[PDB]
A paper describes a structure:
RARs are members of the nuclear receptor (NR) superfamily and act as ligand-inducible transcription factors binding to DNA regulatory elements in the promoter regions of target genes by forming heterodimers with another NR, the retinoid X receptor (RXR). These structures revealed that RAR LBDs exhibit a common fold comprising 12 α-helices (H1-H12) and a short β-turn (s1-s2) arranged in three layers to form an antiparallel “α-helical sandwich”. Another key component of the LBD is the C-terminal helix (H12) which is repositioned upon agonist binding to complete a hydrophobic surface with residues from helices H3 and H4 that is specifically recognized by the LxxLL motifs (also called NR boxes) of CoAs.
BMS411 appeared as a potent RARα antagonist with no or little antagonizing effect on RARβ and RARx, respectively. Strikingly, the 3D structures of RARβ LBD in complex with BMS411 or BMS948 showed an alternative conformation of the amide function. In contrast to RARα, and because of the presence of an alanine residue in RARβ H3 instead of Ser232 in RARα, the carbonyl moiety of the amide linker of BMS948 and BMS411 points toward RARβ A225. This flipping by 180° of the amide bond induces a change in the position of the rings B and C of BMS948 and BMS411 as compared to that of Am580 and BMS614 in RARα. Whereas the two methyl groups of BMS411 are involved in strong van der Waals interactions with LBP residues in both receptor subtypes, the lack of such chemical groups in BMS948 results respectively in a modest and strong loss of van der Waals contacts between this ligand and LBP residues in RARβ and RARα. Thus, as compared to the RARβ situation, the flipping by 180° of the amide bond of BMS411 in RARα is very likely to induce a complete reorientation of the rings B and C, and bring the phenyl extension D in a position similar to that observed for the quinolyl group of BMS614, thereby interfering unfavorably with the stable positioning of H12 in the active conformation. Overall, this structural analysis shows that the mode of binding of BMS411 to RARβ allows accommodation of the phenyl ring of the ligand within the confined environment of the active conformation. In contrast, in RARα the conformational change of BMS411 induces the reorientation of the bulky extension which projects toward H12 and prevents the active conformation of RARα from being stably formed.
Author numbering:
A (entry chain F), D (entry chain G): 629 to 639
B (entry chain B): 169 to 408
C (entry chain A): 170 to 408
Write the structure that this text describes.
């Protein structure tokens, strides 16, 4: 649901 | 006997002092620079200042994510919890950071690019009716003489909190938080030897941040309604 | 007879006492219910508002009496006494009502004994904050806080050197220091089993400030919802 | 300009 926060947290 | 041995917590304390320093440049380590934009008087909103403020806020949030992932155990939590912790504590840390960049003599605040705005310009940039309140908080930190190590731990304690709503493994978060509390309690002790009352005094600053970030959430909504464009996507994701 | 220990115990007892004699325990109240809008949420139940705000007003009066019993409080300037009271009003109103929570019935009990369910709390005025407040009441129950802890927690919220527009922040700030110590010592003396309980309990004030900030916003919304003015004392506290 | 809180203070 959170595109950015999730991409930054994946790597 | 003077201080006992605490090898692990000394190490943890360093791993956090480093994460903070390397995701947030110190005031002395910055090349300040001012602007003439609406420096004289308070206005509703200076778009020029907002544009730069919003941009710098975005970047700081990116730094905060980075700082979080560098916290031992954080990347251990589920992606859902990591997001939950960040969203709840993001504003608290944004406040804490800009307030540790306060220069009391010029009454200004300094961003990570060196941009230095005065009380009026901070208001005009987006602080609005929360200006004097945040500046008051800044002045209240000074007597505490916090360093990078204490600011990093306080930030980590703020983020790593097992009370947040919707935490999948809140008890797992609790586990990660307590060594941070012990780490702070001890570091303050060695640093400020027989000058105590300081641990609870510093810890209670989270109380102050929480109050401000709560009003801050409403300020963001009023700004969302005030600015011509959209609120930067990363910002909306942190406040949603 | 170490000196500071004696002074801190003295401070502790005095605050436990001030709390008990200005705020009855849930177990010692004669509970009674009402049927007003108990089954469904509405924007505002004017009848519940009246009773609610009346009880709140009477609690605010108790809160004032509690402050006046806090060591050094009447030693502050008049303006600062007023200022501290206003900035801590919601904090203590929240804390107090959340310690009167009963988990089975999902209710909160006022000091006259009145017991309302979650829906009636909402309809009385809590509105959109209802669930937030109840959630905090649940996280609080396991702490098993007593009058000494709750009273010290209230004293700490009240004697806060970081409030806006204080004339003598330093004096207030130093006045708070022994409160923090008494709490730590009491918690440790009372809960040797669980360490780190001092930060845990102490930081529930974080929740209070958060809800209180929202609270002040809630009150503005109510001002335009209620077909009349709020009780004058509440008006003054919320200014 | 309320007078209640002050009157309550003075007891
Ligand atoms: C709560 C308050 C006082 C007002 C609301 C803020 C805000 C957040 C998102 C959008 C618009 C306003 C807001 C934003 C910040 C903020 O971005 N802080 C910050 C900004 C940049 C930096 C940096 O460059 O190092 C450090 C800290 C700090 C304080 C707040
Ligand atoms: C902030 C919140 C969550 C919602 C706003 C309240 C309120 C305060 C003043 C005017 C209108 C609403 C509000 C009021 C109270 C409140 O009046 N608490 C309270 C009232 C009475 C008693 C008592 O009889 O023992 C105990 C606690 C508690 C919580 C709040």
């Amino acid at each position: 649901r959170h595109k950015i926060l999730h991409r930054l947290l994946q790597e | 006997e003077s201080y006992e041995m605490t090898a692990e917590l000394d190490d943890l304390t360093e791993k956090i002092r480093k994460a903070h320093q390397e995701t947030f440049p110190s005031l002395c380590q910055l090349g300040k620079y001012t602007t003439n934009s609406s420096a004289d008087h308070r206005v509703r909103l200076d778009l020029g200042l907002w544009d730069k403020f919003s941009e710098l806020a975005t970047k700081c949030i990116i730094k905060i994510v980075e700082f979080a992932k560098r916290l031992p155990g954080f990347t251990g939590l589920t992606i859902a919890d990591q997001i939950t912790l960040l969203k709840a504590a993001c504003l608290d840390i944004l406040i804490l950071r800009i307030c540790t960049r306060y220069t009391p003599e010029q009454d200004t605040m300094t961003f990570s690019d060196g941009l230095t705005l005065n009380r009026t310009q901070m208001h005009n940039a987006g602080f609005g009716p929360l200006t004097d309140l945040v500046f008051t908080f800044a002045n209240q930190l000074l007597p505490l003489e916090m360093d990078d190590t204490e600011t990093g731990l306080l930030s980590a304690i703020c983020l790593i909190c097992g009370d947040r709503q919707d935490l999948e493994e809140p008890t797992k978060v609790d586990k990660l938080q307590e060594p941070l509390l012990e780490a702070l309690k001890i570091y303050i002790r060695k640093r400020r030897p027989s000058k105590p009352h300081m641990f609870p005094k510093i810890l209670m600053k989270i109380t102050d941040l929480r109050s401000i970030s709560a009003k801050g959430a409403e300020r963001v909504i009023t700004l969302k309604m005030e600015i011509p464009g959209s609120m930067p996507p990363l910002i909306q994701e942190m406040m949603e």
